[PDB]
Amino acid sequence: YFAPLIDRAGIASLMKSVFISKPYIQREIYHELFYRLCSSKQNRNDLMNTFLFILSEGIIDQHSLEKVYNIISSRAMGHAKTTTVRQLPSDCTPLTVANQTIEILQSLIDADSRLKLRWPLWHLFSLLDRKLITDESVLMDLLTRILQVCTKTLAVLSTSSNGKENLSKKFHLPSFDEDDLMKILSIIMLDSCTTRVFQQTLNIIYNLSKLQGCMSIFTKHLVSLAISIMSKLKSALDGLSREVGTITTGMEINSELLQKFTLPSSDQAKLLKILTTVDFLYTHKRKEEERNVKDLQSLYDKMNGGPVWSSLSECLSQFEKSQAINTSATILLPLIESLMVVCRRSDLSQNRNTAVKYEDAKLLDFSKTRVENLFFPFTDAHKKLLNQMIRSNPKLMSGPFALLVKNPKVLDFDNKRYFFNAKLKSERPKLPITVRREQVFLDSYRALFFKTNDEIKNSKLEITFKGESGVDAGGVTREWYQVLSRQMFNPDYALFLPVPSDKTTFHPNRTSGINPEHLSFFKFIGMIIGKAIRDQCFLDCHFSREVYKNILGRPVSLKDMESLDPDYYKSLVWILENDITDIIEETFSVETDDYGEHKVINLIEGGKDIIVTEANKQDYVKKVVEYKLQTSVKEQMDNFLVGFYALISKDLITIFDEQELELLISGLPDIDVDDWKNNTTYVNYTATCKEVSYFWRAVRSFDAEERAKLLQFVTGTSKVPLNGFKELSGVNGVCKFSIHRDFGSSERLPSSHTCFNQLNLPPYESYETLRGSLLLAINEGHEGFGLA
């Protein structure tokens, strides 16, 4: 029966029923029946309204709870006021009773609407004060969910009721107030707000700002409170401002200050909430197509909090040298979290280079570092273990690491390739292909040819050795990629072959287009390279140190031709480097081995028409390589880019350079170190001139990759021949990457010439200068000798 129902004798009986305690499940019955209590409005109310009056006069303590026991656990016995002198037998506990009524209220009044004398609100506002109410964490999840509901229950009715007293003011809803809003900052800052309670507390305050109409009151009051937060930023951080800055060596300070930032809901998380505030205000409430972003960062930049950063940045990295107990990620990560997540304050986006690195320097710790202005360098100063931890932790990538440009220094590729150990992985119906297993590329046009691009990775690679679609499973690569050293090498077709730029290696070889199926052929290297990546194994055979960048939308390498092909950069020393006065045209059109797009392609804007000048000195030589792999075979690179873009998906993008890819797709090139030591033209630099033989005597010192990535940084065509490298690959493939001293400025770059390798080694000093500069430029890939 709908409509109003019994008034009392179910309520008047409840007087004793409101002093109860029992295991749950018995209480669900209460949920359902009290839900059936709807449509009454008398059983729903009257007792309920005073029940908060009771709780403020009750649960506030067992005594006042016993007071309401006498008042009510009694009135049912005689008349509706007190009597019975009844004494509490512990039949109820404030916590259990409160939480049970709370869950029931959420279950039921959620449906209730159109009615939600501040006394109840005073209980929502004044009683809210109580440590009774400020001494709870276990329920605090449910309390937070409440507070959203209260916001939303109000928000739905906040449309006008909060100001329209027809329904909200049944218990006199004040038209918005701040005292409790101030109470938020004054209390929720406590450890009270669990990490989980912390997040949904952010959500609470988000609603607060929102509800309806509270966007003109709650949001601005919370903004003022946030301003207040800067004041309390150093509530205990100031004492912490040097607690971790003292440690050092075998110094122990213990966990007295650990539980400020290591204790979110005490600090650290405080800064996190500060972030989230304007973030949701901007990232969530606003949207990037609407979000000023800079204003979001302006806050935390114009409202940055500089004071703490320079003061504390100095006090952090002392752990890097110390052997303390409570100055680790426990507390440091809170800072890293903040200091990273923030992406705020002063300059952080200041990615740094390698250069000669002078000769060397001992960066002990993050030395007296300033505010975030000098932070990512702060990271690279704690690099000692920070870089390895990043090599063992991408959780920072998701957390602390919120907005990054410079990080790559400490966030070296070695960290991001570790990410690509899990991000390694980052529907294959059928690809009924044969692929000769020596022809492979040569028959891929008619056999595989990417099976029309990424379909190959979206279809089982039934490619067979000759007819064995299995053997190494679908997509055989054990020798199918090792045989590409013939198919890719492609002695048959012009698609790939010993090139004038690289006789030793096998890159598009210019001609390519002359082959009738070049377009379909390059669809196979559009995939096989992006498929070897998006598939098992890699073909060891090397292409060139300019092919790898051409896989994706990246330019060609001009400084490579210094090594890659001196006939195009060093013999062309009349332009770009060595000698040029913006007049030397130097036949601005390179040899057209292509013969497909043969229009004596201009090496600069106009080539034979326009003079090679400051703008086009690089272009003249660069356009050579552009007319080697990106204009000679550009239409051929069309498929190269199609599959390369198609085959692959967010695969270690921009972490592995061409050398690293050369160390990966072709594998880390091997070396005959014994030869290298007694090779390299070791005396060509004036062995023992305070340097030279120092690296040809202490030879294994640098690194294995520094002896392999160097071989790429000196040739431009990899193809390591070992044997002392006197046949070091190149246009002709000779010279042990000769180490001619050149008696330069002691720091001039090694302008090697793979045809006649030079590897300038000017008058360095006893290691020091010899170390560093070359030890890192070699590990660059397409950044030391390639694109840069």
UniProtKB/Swiss-Prot annotation:
It comes from the Eukaryota. The active site is at C755. It is found in: Nucleus, Nucleolus. Belongs to the UPL family. TOM1/PTR1 subfamily. Probable ubiquitin ligase protein involved in many cellular processes, such as transcription regulation, maintenance of nuclear structure, cell cycle, mRNA export and rRNA maturation. E3 ubiquitin ligase proteins mediate ubiquitination and subsequent proteasomal degradation of target proteins. Involved in transcription regulation by interacting, and probably mediating, ubiquitination of some subunit of the SAGA complex. Required for SPT7 ubiquitination. Participates in mRNA export from the nucleus by regulating the transport of hnRNP proteins. Interacts with the ADA3/NGG1 subunit of the SAGA complex. Interacts with KRR1. Present with 350 molecules/cell in log phase SD medium. This is E3 ubiquitin-protein ligase TOM1. It comes from Saccharomyces cerevisiae (strain ATCC 204508 / S288c) (Baker's yeast).
